mmCIF file of all heavy atoms in Angstrom:
data_model
loop_
_atom_site.group_PDB
_atom_site.id
_atom_site.type_symbol
_atom_site.label_atom_id
_atom_site.label_comp_id
_atom_site.label_asym_id
_atom_site.label_seq_id
_atom_site.Cartn_x
_atom_site.Cartn_y
_atom_site.Cartn_z
ATOM 1 N N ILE A 1 177.870 189.690 30.889
ATOM 2 C CA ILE A 1 177.788 188.312 30.419
ATOM 3 C C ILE A 1 177.603 187.357 31.594
ATOM 4 O O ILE A 1 178.145 187.583 32.690
ATOM 5 C CB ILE A 1 179.036 187.927 29.600
ATOM 6 C CG1 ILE A 1 178.807 186.610 28.854
ATOM 7 C CG2 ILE A 1 180.275 187.832 30.492
ATOM 8 C CD1 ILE A 1 179.825 186.360 27.764
ATOM 9 N N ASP A 2 176.817 186.307 31.376
ATOM 10 C CA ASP A 2 176.581 185.293 32.386
ATOM 11 C C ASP A 2 177.207 183.981 31.916
ATOM 12 O O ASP A 2 176.723 183.349 30.969
ATOM 13 C CB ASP A 2 175.083 185.132 32.660
ATOM 14 C CG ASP A 2 174.485 186.336 33.375
ATOM 15 O OD1 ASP A 2 174.845 186.586 34.536
ATOM 16 O OD2 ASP A 2 173.633 187.037 32.785
ATOM 17 N N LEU A 3 178.306 183.597 32.576
ATOM 18 C CA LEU A 3 179.050 182.396 32.221
ATOM 19 C C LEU A 3 178.602 181.200 33.028
ATOM 20 O O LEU A 3 178.101 181.339 34.146
ATOM 21 C CB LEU A 3 180.556 182.607 32.447
ATOM 22 C CG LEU A 3 181.316 183.540 31.513
ATOM 23 C CD1 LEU A 3 182.794 183.511 31.869
ATOM 24 C CD2 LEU A 3 181.125 183.164 30.053
ATOM 25 N N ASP A 4 178.800 180.013 32.458
ATOM 26 C CA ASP A 4 178.568 178.763 33.153
ATOM 27 C C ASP A 4 179.851 178.412 33.908
ATOM 28 O O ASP A 4 180.814 177.938 33.305
ATOM 29 C CB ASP A 4 178.236 177.645 32.160
ATOM 30 C CG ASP A 4 177.950 176.318 32.837
ATOM 31 O OD1 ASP A 4 178.107 176.204 34.075
ATOM 32 O OD2 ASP A 4 177.569 175.361 32.122
ATOM 33 N N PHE A 5 179.862 178.640 35.216
ATOM 34 C CA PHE A 5 181.107 178.453 35.988
ATOM 35 C C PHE A 5 181.368 176.994 36.374
ATOM 36 O O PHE A 5 182.404 176.688 36.989
ATOM 37 C CB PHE A 5 181.115 179.393 37.206
ATOM 38 C CG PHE A 5 181.203 180.838 36.828
ATOM 39 C CD1 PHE A 5 180.074 181.648 36.844
ATOM 40 C CD2 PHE A 5 182.404 181.387 36.415
ATOM 41 C CE1 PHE A 5 180.157 182.978 36.483
ATOM 42 C CE2 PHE A 5 182.492 182.713 36.048
ATOM 43 C CZ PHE A 5 181.367 183.514 36.084
ATOM 44 N N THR A 6 180.453 176.093 35.998
ATOM 45 C CA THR A 6 180.635 174.662 36.207
ATOM 46 C C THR A 6 181.491 174.005 35.120
ATOM 47 O O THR A 6 181.773 172.816 35.211
ATOM 48 C CB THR A 6 179.280 173.903 36.257
ATOM 49 O OG1 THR A 6 178.707 173.852 34.944
ATOM 50 C CG2 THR A 6 178.310 174.561 37.211
ATOM 51 N N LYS A 7 181.883 174.751 34.088
ATOM 52 C CA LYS A 7 182.751 174.224 33.033
ATOM 53 C C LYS A 7 183.991 175.101 32.875
ATOM 54 O O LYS A 7 183.953 176.284 33.190
ATOM 55 C CB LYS A 7 181.977 174.147 31.712
ATOM 56 C CG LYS A 7 180.725 173.289 31.826
ATOM 57 C CD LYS A 7 179.909 173.281 30.545
ATOM 58 C CE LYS A 7 178.567 172.609 30.766
ATOM 59 N NZ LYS A 7 178.717 171.192 31.182
ATOM 60 N N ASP A 8 185.088 174.517 32.399
ATOM 61 C CA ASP A 8 186.350 175.251 32.275
ATOM 62 C C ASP A 8 186.627 175.601 30.827
ATOM 63 O O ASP A 8 186.050 175.008 29.920
ATOM 64 C CB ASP A 8 187.512 174.426 32.847
ATOM 65 C CG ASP A 8 188.716 175.279 33.234
ATOM 66 O OD1 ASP A 8 188.694 176.499 33.011
ATOM 67 O OD2 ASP A 8 189.697 174.729 33.771
ATOM 68 N N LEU A 9 187.506 176.580 30.634
ATOM 69 C CA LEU A 9 188.020 176.950 29.329
ATOM 70 C C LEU A 9 189.117 175.966 28.907
ATOM 71 O O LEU A 9 190.047 175.685 29.671
ATOM 72 C CB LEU A 9 188.598 178.371 29.354
ATOM 73 C CG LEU A 9 187.608 179.542 29.256
ATOM 74 C CD1 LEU A 9 186.585 179.527 30.377
ATOM 75 C CD2 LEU A 9 188.367 180.856 29.242
ATOM 76 N N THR A 10 189.000 175.465 27.683
ATOM 77 C CA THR A 10 189.973 174.541 27.101
ATOM 78 C C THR A 10 190.372 175.052 25.727
ATOM 79 O O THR A 10 189.601 175.764 25.075
ATOM 80 C CB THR A 10 189.354 173.145 26.956
ATOM 81 O OG1 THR A 10 188.619 172.840 28.144
ATOM 82 C CG2 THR A 10 190.432 172.084 26.736
ATOM 83 N N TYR A 11 191.580 174.704 25.297
ATOM 84 C CA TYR A 11 192.118 175.185 24.034
ATOM 85 C C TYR A 11 192.679 174.037 23.209
ATOM 86 O O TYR A 11 193.270 173.102 23.749
ATOM 87 C CB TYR A 11 193.228 176.207 24.278
ATOM 88 C CG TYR A 11 192.738 177.492 24.893
ATOM 89 C CD1 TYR A 11 192.883 177.734 26.255
ATOM 90 C CD2 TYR A 11 192.087 178.452 24.125
ATOM 91 C CE1 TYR A 11 192.430 178.907 26.823
ATOM 92 C CE2 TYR A 11 191.628 179.634 24.688
ATOM 93 C CZ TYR A 11 191.798 179.855 26.037
ATOM 94 O OH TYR A 11 191.338 181.027 26.602
ATOM 95 N N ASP A 12 192.480 174.112 21.896
ATOM 96 C CA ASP A 12 193.172 173.211 20.980
ATOM 97 C C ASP A 12 194.651 173.546 20.957
ATOM 98 O O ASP A 12 195.066 174.660 21.303
ATOM 99 C CB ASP A 12 192.593 173.321 19.566
ATOM 100 C CG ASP A 12 191.213 172.712 19.456
ATOM 101 O OD1 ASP A 12 190.822 171.945 20.355
ATOM 102 O OD2 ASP A 12 190.514 172.991 18.463
ATOM 103 N N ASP A 13 195.449 172.573 20.532
ATOM 104 C CA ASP A 13 196.886 172.761 20.406
ATOM 105 C C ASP A 13 197.164 173.940 19.500
ATOM 106 O O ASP A 13 196.406 174.206 18.576
ATOM 107 C CB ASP A 13 197.549 171.506 19.830
ATOM 108 C CG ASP A 13 197.297 170.273 20.675
ATOM 109 O OD1 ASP A 13 197.024 170.430 21.888
ATOM 110 O OD2 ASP A 13 197.358 169.150 20.127
ATOM 111 N N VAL A 14 198.242 174.655 19.789
ATOM 112 C CA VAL A 14 198.710 175.725 18.932
ATOM 113 C C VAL A 14 199.227 175.074 17.649
ATOM 114 O O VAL A 14 200.011 174.133 17.724
ATOM 115 C CB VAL A 14 199.836 176.530 19.607
ATOM 116 C CG1 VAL A 14 200.475 177.505 18.623
ATOM 117 C CG2 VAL A 14 199.296 177.268 20.837
ATOM 118 N N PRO A 15 198.790 175.562 16.471
ATOM 119 C CA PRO A 15 199.260 174.916 15.232
ATOM 120 C C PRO A 15 200.760 175.047 14.996
ATOM 121 O O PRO A 15 201.365 176.045 15.387
ATOM 122 C CB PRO A 15 198.486 175.653 14.134
ATOM 123 C CG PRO A 15 197.294 176.225 14.822
ATOM 124 C CD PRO A 15 197.776 176.592 16.192
ATOM 125 N N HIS A 16 201.348 174.039 14.354
ATOM 126 C CA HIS A 16 202.766 174.071 14.007
ATOM 127 C C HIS A 16 203.049 175.029 12.845
ATOM 128 O O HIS A 16 204.062 175.723 12.844
ATOM 129 C CB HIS A 16 203.268 172.670 13.654
ATOM 130 C CG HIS A 16 204.755 172.585 13.496
ATOM 131 N ND1 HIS A 16 205.595 172.205 14.521
ATOM 132 C CD2 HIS A 16 205.555 172.840 12.432
ATOM 133 C CE1 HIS A 16 206.845 172.227 14.096
ATOM 134 N NE2 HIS A 16 206.848 172.611 12.832
ATOM 135 N N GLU A 17 202.151 175.059 11.862
ATOM 136 C CA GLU A 17 202.391 175.791 10.625
ATOM 137 C C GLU A 17 201.703 177.151 10.615
ATOM 138 O O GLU A 17 200.531 177.270 10.986
ATOM 139 C CB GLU A 17 201.908 174.975 9.417
ATOM 140 C CG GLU A 17 202.487 173.567 9.313
ATOM 141 C CD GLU A 17 204.005 173.529 9.177
ATOM 142 O OE1 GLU A 17 204.631 174.555 8.823
ATOM 143 O OE2 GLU A 17 204.577 172.447 9.427
ATOM 144 N N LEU A 18 202.443 178.163 10.170
ATOM 145 C CA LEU A 18 201.921 179.516 9.994
ATOM 146 C C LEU A 18 200.566 179.534 9.287
ATOM 147 O O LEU A 18 199.646 180.236 9.709
ATOM 148 C CB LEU A 18 202.933 180.359 9.209
ATOM 149 C CG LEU A 18 202.629 181.844 8.989
ATOM 150 C CD1 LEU A 18 202.254 182.546 10.288
ATOM 151 C CD2 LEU A 18 203.829 182.518 8.343
ATOM 152 N N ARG A 19 200.451 178.746 8.221
ATOM 153 C CA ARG A 19 199.226 178.669 7.427
ATOM 154 C C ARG A 19 197.992 178.409 8.295
ATOM 155 O O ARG A 19 197.008 179.150 8.214
ATOM 156 C CB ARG A 19 199.358 177.571 6.360
ATOM 157 C CG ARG A 19 198.278 177.587 5.291
ATOM 158 C CD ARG A 19 198.502 176.478 4.274
ATOM 159 N NE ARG A 19 197.510 176.511 3.198
ATOM 160 C CZ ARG A 19 197.389 175.588 2.243
ATOM 161 N NH1 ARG A 19 198.197 174.530 2.208
ATOM 162 N NH2 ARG A 19 196.447 175.721 1.315
ATOM 163 N N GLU A 20 198.044 177.371 9.128
ATOM 164 C CA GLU A 20 196.878 177.003 9.945
ATOM 165 C C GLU A 20 196.589 178.040 11.032
ATOM 166 O O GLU A 20 195.436 178.216 11.430
ATOM 167 C CB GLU A 20 197.037 175.616 10.575
ATOM 168 C CG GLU A 20 195.700 174.965 10.922
ATOM 169 C CD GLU A 20 195.807 173.864 11.966
ATOM 170 O OE1 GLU A 20 196.850 173.174 12.012
ATOM 171 O OE2 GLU A 20 194.835 173.687 12.738
ATOM 172 N N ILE A 21 197.636 178.720 11.501
ATOM 173 C CA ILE A 21 197.486 179.793 12.485
ATOM 174 C C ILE A 21 196.655 180.937 11.898
ATOM 175 O O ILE A 21 195.724 181.433 12.538
ATOM 176 C CB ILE A 21 198.857 180.346 12.954
ATOM 177 C CG1 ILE A 21 199.632 179.279 13.738
ATOM 178 C CG2 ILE A 21 198.668 181.593 13.815
ATOM 179 C CD1 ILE A 21 201.069 179.657 14.033
ATOM 180 N N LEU A 22 196.988 181.338 10.672
ATOM 181 C CA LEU A 22 196.307 182.459 10.021
ATOM 182 C C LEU A 22 194.849 182.148 9.678
ATOM 183 O O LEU A 22 194.031 183.058 9.600
ATOM 184 C CB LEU A 22 197.062 182.902 8.767
ATOM 185 C CG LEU A 22 198.516 183.346 8.973
ATOM 186 C CD1 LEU A 22 199.200 183.574 7.633
ATOM 187 C CD2 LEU A 22 198.612 184.592 9.839
ATOM 188 N N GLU A 23 194.516 180.877 9.485
ATOM 189 C CA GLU A 23 193.128 180.506 9.223
ATOM 190 C C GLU A 23 192.299 180.424 10.504
ATOM 191 O O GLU A 23 191.105 180.721 10.481
ATOM 192 C CB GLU A 23 193.043 179.193 8.443
ATOM 193 C CG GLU A 23 191.661 178.936 7.843
ATOM 194 C CD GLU A 23 191.702 178.603 6.360
ATOM 195 O OE1 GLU A 23 192.528 177.754 5.962
ATOM 196 O OE2 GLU A 23 190.906 179.191 5.592
ATOM 197 N N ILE A 24 192.927 180.021 11.611
ATOM 198 C CA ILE A 24 192.238 179.927 12.908
ATOM 199 C C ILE A 24 191.886 181.318 13.441
ATOM 200 O O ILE A 24 190.806 181.522 13.997
ATOM 201 C CB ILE A 24 193.069 179.133 13.948
ATOM 202 C CG1 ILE A 24 193.132 177.648 13.560
ATOM 203 C CG2 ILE A 24 192.487 179.280 15.353
ATOM 204 C CD1 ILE A 24 191.840 176.877 13.758
ATOM 205 N N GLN A 25 192.796 182.269 13.274
ATOM 206 C CA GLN A 25 192.458 183.665 13.495
ATOM 207 C C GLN A 25 193.193 184.582 12.513
ATOM 208 O O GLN A 25 194.333 184.979 12.754
ATOM 209 C CB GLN A 25 192.707 184.079 14.947
ATOM 210 C CG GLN A 25 194.042 183.655 15.527
ATOM 211 C CD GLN A 25 194.233 184.190 16.932
ATOM 212 O OE1 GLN A 25 193.720 183.625 17.902
ATOM 213 N NE2 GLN A 25 194.963 185.292 17.047
ATOM 214 N N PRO A 26 192.534 184.916 11.386
ATOM 215 C CA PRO A 26 193.088 185.978 10.559
ATOM 216 C C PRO A 26 192.938 187.289 11.314
ATOM 217 O O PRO A 26 192.137 187.366 12.243
ATOM 218 C CB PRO A 26 192.208 185.950 9.307
ATOM 219 C CG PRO A 26 190.908 185.391 9.769
ATOM 220 C CD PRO A 26 191.244 184.423 10.868
ATOM 221 N N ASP A 27 193.713 188.293 10.925
ATOM 222 C CA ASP A 27 193.787 189.592 11.622
ATOM 223 C C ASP A 27 194.867 189.639 12.710
ATOM 224 O O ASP A 27 195.061 190.684 13.339
ATOM 225 C CB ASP A 27 192.407 190.107 12.117
ATOM 226 C CG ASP A 27 192.017 189.605 13.515
ATOM 227 O OD1 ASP A 27 192.890 189.383 14.381
ATOM 228 O OD2 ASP A 27 190.799 189.444 13.747
ATOM 229 N N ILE A 28 195.575 188.525 12.918
ATOM 230 C CA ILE A 28 196.786 188.522 13.747
ATOM 231 C C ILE A 28 197.719 189.649 13.315
ATOM 232 O O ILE A 28 198.340 190.304 14.153
ATOM 233 C CB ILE A 28 197.545 187.169 13.669
ATOM 234 C CG1 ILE A 28 196.954 186.169 14.668
ATOM 235 C CG2 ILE A 28 199.035 187.351 13.958
ATOM 236 C CD1 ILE A 28 197.699 184.850 14.755
#
């Protein structure tokens, strides 16, 4: 893989509710 090293990895806040967690990544 060839990444763009001029940009950083960023993340959205971890959800408070179990429900939203399971929709963001089912298969947990």
Side-chain angles (χ1 to χ4, degrees):
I1 193 165
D2 290 294
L3 289 184
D4 181 354
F5 293 102
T6 72
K7 302 176 189 299
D8 202 357
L9 280 59
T10 317
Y11 293 100
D12 289 344
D13 302 336
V14 171
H16 189 95
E17 305 299 342
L18 184 50
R19 192 179 183 187
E20 204 201 328
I21 294 170
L22 301 172
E23 194 129 47
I24 291 288
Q25 47 176 81
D27 88 32
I28 275 185

